[PDB]
Amino acid sequence: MIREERLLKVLRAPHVSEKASTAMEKSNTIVLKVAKDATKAEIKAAVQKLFEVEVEVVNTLVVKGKVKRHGQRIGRRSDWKKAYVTLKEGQNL
Template structure:
């Protein structure tokens, strides 16, 4: 594992939350990938190390998407949602990730 060069406290904060949606479920089934919302300054090696540390799985690759926040109106005022960074984490063949906390 490549967690030696990263601070473990930082790795625990990199993954903000898993993304559970219809699109995420379809991607998970088709490409064996899992989606996470991550910190905006997180790097691909950090994301890989964090997933391997927290879920005890082997990660094959990581792709990231920077999603711009939508402009929304609240009555008269115009606001903006925060920008979000998403990580598409590809797991190695035969690896499975479950969020229930039990060992597979």
């Protein structure tokens, strides 16, 4: 039936609830911060198993981490991938 559940730890954290995620929430979709290697099928199965809601489509985006520190100690933020999973009718999240 469903893919093995130890690989359903891909969903890391939802979001910070900023206005892009919330405006896109009140229009159609929820925004999720997910893994680094999670396939769109894995994000979809993880939503449909760990949450109770079916999902129409996933849009996957990885975003570069920032440098964010000054010249005394140059650092870099870790890369992360964000998913827009589409929940069209009966959205409960």
